[PDB]
Amino acid sequence: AEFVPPPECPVFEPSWEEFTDPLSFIGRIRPLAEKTGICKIRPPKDWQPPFACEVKSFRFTPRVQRLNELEAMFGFEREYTLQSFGEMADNFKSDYFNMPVHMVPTELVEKEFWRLVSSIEEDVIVEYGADISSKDFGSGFPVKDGRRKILPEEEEYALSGWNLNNMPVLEQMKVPWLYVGMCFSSFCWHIEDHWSYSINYLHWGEPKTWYGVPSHAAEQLEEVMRELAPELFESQPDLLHQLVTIMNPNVLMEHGVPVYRTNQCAGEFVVTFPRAYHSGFNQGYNFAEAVNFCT
Numbered sequence: 001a002e003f004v005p006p007p008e009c010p011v012f013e014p015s016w017e018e019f020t021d022p023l024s025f026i027g028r029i030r031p032l033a034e035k036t037g038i039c040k041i042r043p044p045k046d047w048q049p050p051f052a053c054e055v056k057s058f059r060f061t062p063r064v065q066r067l068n069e070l071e072a073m074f075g076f077e078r079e080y081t082l083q084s085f086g087e088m089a090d091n092f093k094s095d096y097f098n099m100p101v102h103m104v105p106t107e108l109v110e111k112e113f114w115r116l117v118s119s120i121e122e123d124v125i126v127e128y129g130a131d132i133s134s135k136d137f138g139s140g141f142p143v144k145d146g147r148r149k150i151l152p153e154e155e156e157y158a159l160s161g162w163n164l165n166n167m168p169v170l171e172q173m174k175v176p177w178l179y180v181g182m183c184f185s186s187f188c189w190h191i192e193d194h195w196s197y198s199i200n201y202l203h204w205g206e207p208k209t210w211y212g213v214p215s216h217a218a219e220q221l222e223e224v225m226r227e228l229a230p231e232l233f234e235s236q237p238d239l240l241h242q243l244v245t246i247m248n249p250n251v252l253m254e255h256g257v258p259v260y261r262t263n264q265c266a267g268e269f270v271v272t273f274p275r276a277y278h279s280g281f282n283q284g285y286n287f288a289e290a291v292n293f294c295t
């Protein structure tokens with residue numbers, strides 16, 4: 001049985017008037033987006049912030065991820081540059097599918113990803129950078145710090161409300177984190193600390209595939225997760241269990257849990273609503289930035 005893609009989550013293409021600030025816009029789309037857990041926001045075509053990270057000195061040690069670690073029930077983290085990681089990432093994907101990386105359909109990577117997660121005869125290992133502080137490496141967005149030069153054409157993005165460094169983070173301190181992905185690199189089902197909102201921007205690269213569950217089904221997902229989780233992980237606290245909450249979306253959908261999907265492309269935002277469980281994986285070499293915010 002092949003993977004059945006969940007229905008698509010809402011995609012909003014606001015005009016320049018509606019693109020005023022995220023909090024006011026997110027508040028207006030809330031009646032629909034909170035019923036799907038996640039949503040995608042495409043900025044106007046003329047809104048193109050330049051990549052402001054120091055690519056030359058961007059050196060990181062990615063995490064190692066075995067796709068079928070739960071099904072099977074040694075591996076250690078090589079330092080890459082942003083360019084050397086991309087060469088490895090593209091070589092892996094083109095070799096795996098035996099075709100140019102830009103020719104692999106997104107539905108094929110999705111179908112192959114979920115086959116490998118539950119496959120016991122093929123062990124696929126990938127690498128990714130995650131939770132990289134924008135303070136130590138610089139943000140993908142231009143920032144008024146004096147650390148790097150801001151051109152006059154870039155000041156509008158350093159002051160934009162959609163710049164993740166300008167999101168309100170103080171609940172009635174925190175900085176955005178960076179994520180460098182490759183094909184099959186994934187993140188497990190989780191919600192944010194304090195049931196916070198989260199906003200995610202894909203600066204460049206191949207798409208990031210998301211799955212989302214509305215907050216009204218959070219208890220149902222947790223019950224399905226605990227009923228099907230291994231016996232040794234079923235009783236673990238949520239903060240620790242979320243580190244290994246891998247589950248095919250079709251399994252949740254079979255148990256009545258509503259699940260929505262989307263492919264986040266370069267230059268697009270993804271917002272997850274409070275207590276909306278979400279998971280996903282990367283289609284290929286990409287660079288993302290994320291922050292939890294409060295309304």
Ligand SMILES: CC(C)c1cc(C(=O)N2CC[C@@H](NC(=O)C3CC3)C2)[nH]n1
Pocket residue numbers: 128129130177179180181185186187192198200208281282288290291292
């Ligand atoms: C604000 C911080 C705490 C955060 C990050 C996320 C999240 O869910 N993200 C980030 C991008 C994507 N993760 C990946 O692509 C991983 C494989 C490399 C999903 N939520 N809050």
Ligand SMILES: [Mn+2]
Pocket residue numbers: 190191192198272278
């Ligand atoms: Mn998240």
